[PDB]
Paper text:
Mycobacterium sp. JS330 produces 2-nitroimidazole nitrohydrolase (NnhA) that circumvents 2NI activation, conferring 2NI resistance by hydrolysing it to nitrite and imidazol-2-one (IM2O) instead. The initial characterization of NnhA indicated that, unlike most other known enzymes that degrade nitroaromatic compounds, NnhA is a hydrolase that functions without catalytic metal ions, molecular oxygen, or other cofactors. Despite low sequence similarity and limited occurrence in a few soil-dwelling mycobacteria and Actinomycetota, NnhA maintains the α/β propeller fold characteristic of GME superfamily enzymes and forms an unusual hexameric ring structure formed by a trimer of domain-swapped dimers. The residues in the active site of NnhA appear somewhat conserved in comparison to the ADI and DDAH, with the catalytic histidine, glutamic acid, and cysteine residues present in NnhA as H260, E197, and C357.
Using this process, we identified a variant of NnhA containing three amino acid substitutions (T2I, G14D, and K73R) that exhibited a substantial increase in soluble protein production in E. coli compared to the WT when analyzed on an SDS-PAGE gel. We isolated and purified this variant protein (referred to as “soluble NnhA”) with a yield of 8 mg of protein per liter of E. coli culture and compared its catalytic activity with the WT protein. With data close to 2 Å resolution (2.04 and 2.16 Å), the quality of the electron density maps was good and showed unambiguous density from residue R11 to R379 at the C-terminus. In the unit cell of the P1 space group obtained for soluble NnhA, three homodimers are arranged to create a hexameric ring, with a large pore in the middle. There are three dimers found in the hexameric structure, and therefore each protomer has interactions with three other protomers, including its dimerization partner. NnhA also has an N-terminal extension that makes extensive interactions with the adjoining protomer to form a domain-swapped homodimer, the presence of which also distorts the first β-sheet in the proceeding ββαβ motif. The third T2I mutation is not resolved in the structure as it is located at the start of the polypeptide near the N-terminal His-tag. Both G14D and K73R introduce oppositely charged residues that are located such that they could potentially introduce a salt-bridge interaction to strengthen the dimer interface. However, the minimum distance observed between them in all the crystal structures was 6.2 Å, which is further than the expected 2–4 Å for a salt bridge but may still be relevant when the protein is in solution and in a dynamic state. The conformational flexibility within the oligomerized complex was also supported by the crystal structure, where high B-factors were observed in surface residues of some protomers but not others.
Residue numbers in the entry:
A (entry chain A), B (entry chain B): 11 to 379
C (entry chain C): 226 to 302
The structure:
């Protein structure tokens, strides 16, 4: 459209004969997401909900991506093994890690999902040491309304990284920032949603109440939904993972939607209040295999491509058969090397755009019991 | 520092023998501004307070910087004159506008202040028309903790512009975003501070309570101060300016600090509650000349370089003499072309860095009455 | 708690409430239990034996702030 072709009618709040007060008031009442954020970006964005995923980002590992090669890790493996708490399966193999990355990218491409690639500098470091955990791009997933700078609860190696990803999103995709978390802890990208307006968080090493309150207040305003619900799990774990039980600080390892009103869920996830809430709101629970969970094969860490279709770890044979039995298509992808650190396949995916999908009302209205 | 020289002692929360729980808790308790925002940026930043200004940005006008060249302005001058409410002083002259810009830059250089330059594209437009008001870079001033995306209450021509300035600050200076305002109206860069922890806002066309609450909550957490105060003026004005009275929607036209516990203030600014608050907190008021105020010569729009030294419009002879009588040095700078739109000299300056300066306690402790 | 607090013989009364992830009495996948007596117990003044499956973050914080020392039970046992 030509620079000299613009007219007052191109301003949505403008009307012939409108008073100053009325124009201003209409401006104050406009919706931020649809009036400002999306039009200025030139596109929709946000991974909220359980609708159709269209766009993601991955990181192709280099030798600097490997947590066990940080000089700080070398100084004290046991310090980082306490923070992470995941089973020791030996050193990360770079070549195999690269191969499973290619396989994940192909799964997306075979299903019509756009894949962007995020690179980091050589010898990447923040003020406190080498980057660590920066393969886990879910930590930079984009909300309706914009990107978030996180406060990491347990991993100093991620300082600077949510900044880098948000900046990448702005420069590469024109997606703006929504908020920085500035108190307590909050790692929103490791949260997930089980309906269009239902967020699952934890209280854990990765989330306190103050951080949660700040994040939820910001994303609720741009959620595109009338109401917003936060189901808060209360896992018994000290760091990231509890290898005695399968309990995890991140929702993405405890629970995930596989279809409308159907969740895959860890044995270690549901305290009584959470169970009651899910029951009352008509969610059907597919229980993950207990050994798969406890051994950190990440059977709940499935990525929903759309209701009824997920990407899952190829070696979660028992959980994946239960998911298929629930009428859901499973795309199996190798995820052996990724699980040597604090996450699985879903955890490594930055979700950029998901189309609007089924609501909590749709969950409540499904007749299945 | 070498990539392989990092040790655990480089992590501030680390200590020999610390448990996982204790390390995580120390991480949750760390201060965002000094642990994350500033170290990742590689520098301090923020214009908060009344200390020494060190760094600003200006825009050198082009033909597209002129509001009277927008096709929307041409379609209805009276619409925009209703929104703005400022006296008509005739057409902007590009070349003279450029000249007064160079004069302001020289004043900054003569006073030891670093000046960055912001350019816009040719034929710059947002989703709703040509940019308008984009010379006024105060709207992009940087807070302790980071940049802000604003919700403009009356000027659709600024949609997209606070985004552009924040992105510029991130790419050019490595300064991160703090928050996007997503409800109501809030134009924080046209606010000003009268002590290290005292923010002056208005309730007006440019600010509602919801927008104010969002902004104040965000900047208070990174203010670097134990307490934070918001003095809210209640000007009687419909749009930007009330040409019958001198009242303005923006604090920056109503009031400004000139020294520790000394303010220049418009006759039209102080409702009884605001006057009482200023009295109880020991602020001395220098009243701007009423004719200079009403004629929009912007006599309260002075830029504090440090306590006791301001830049002011060269033609505010009466107010400037009152400021000098109060023991403050005035640097007079031409600001004729800038005032044809909704702002004065201070309004066109993006403040990037101001050193920590006197506190509300310092104001309260000054003995002068 | 209202009933026993009035006859406790003590000026104050505190209830630490654990939130175990278990559907019935016992969770054989995790070691979590519906009963406190299987999750935690005092062994001396300010020293507790405690299950890996017992302590949510709020409970852990409360115990830490009140100076209780935790001996972790063997996870397989
Ligand atoms: Na719960
Ligand atoms: Na000032
Ligand atoms: Na508890």
């Amino acid at each position: 459209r030509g620079y000299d072709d613009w007219r007052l009618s191109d301003i949505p709040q403008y009307k012939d004969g409108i008073s100053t007060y009325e124009f201003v008031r209409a401006t104050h009442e406009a919706d931020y997401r649809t009036h400002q954020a999306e039009p200025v970006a030139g596109r929709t964005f946000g991974f909220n909900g359980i609708g159709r995923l269209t766009e993601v980002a991955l990181h192709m590992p280099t030798r600097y991506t490997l947590h066990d090669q940080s000089s700080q890790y070398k100084e004290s493996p046991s310090f980082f093994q306490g923070l992470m708490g995941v089973p020791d399966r030996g050193p990360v193999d770079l070549a195999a890690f690269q191969r499973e990355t290619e396989e994940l990218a192909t799964a997306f491409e075979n299903n019509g999902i756009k894949v962007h690639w995020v690179d980091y500098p050589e010898e990447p470091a923040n003020p406190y040491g080498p980057l660590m955990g920066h393969v886990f791009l879910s930590w930079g997933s984009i909300w309706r309304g914009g990107s978030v700078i996180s406060r990491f609860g347990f991993l100093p190696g991620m300082v600077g990284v949510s900044e880098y990803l948000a900046k990448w999103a702005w420069n590469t995709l024109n997606i703006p920032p929504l908020v920085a978390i500035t108190e307590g802890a909050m790692e929103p990208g490791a949260c997930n949603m089980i309906a269009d307006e239902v967020l699952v968080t934890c209280l854990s090493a990765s989330y306190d109440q103050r951080g949660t309150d700040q994040l939820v207040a910001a994303i609720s305003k741009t959620s595109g939904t009338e109401e917003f619900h936060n189901l808060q799990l209360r896992p018994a774990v000290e760091g990231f993972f509890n290898k005695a039980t399968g309990a995890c600080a991140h929702p993405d390892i405890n629970i995930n939607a596989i279809d409308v009103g159907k969740l895959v869920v860890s044995p270690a996830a549901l305290d009584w209040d959470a169970r009651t809430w899910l029951y009352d709101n008509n969610f059907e629970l597919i229980e993950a295999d207990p050994d798969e969970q406890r051994e950190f094969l990440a059977p709940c860490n499935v990525l929903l491509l759309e209701p009824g279709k997920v990407i899952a770890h190829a070696d979660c044979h028992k959980t994946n058969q239960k998911i298929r039995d629930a009428g859901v298509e499973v795309i199996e992808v190798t995820g052996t090397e990724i699980r040597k650190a604090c996450g699985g396949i879903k955890c490594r995916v930055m979700q950029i755009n998901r189309e609007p999908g089924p609501t909590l009302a749709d969950v409540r209205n499904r007749v299945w019991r």
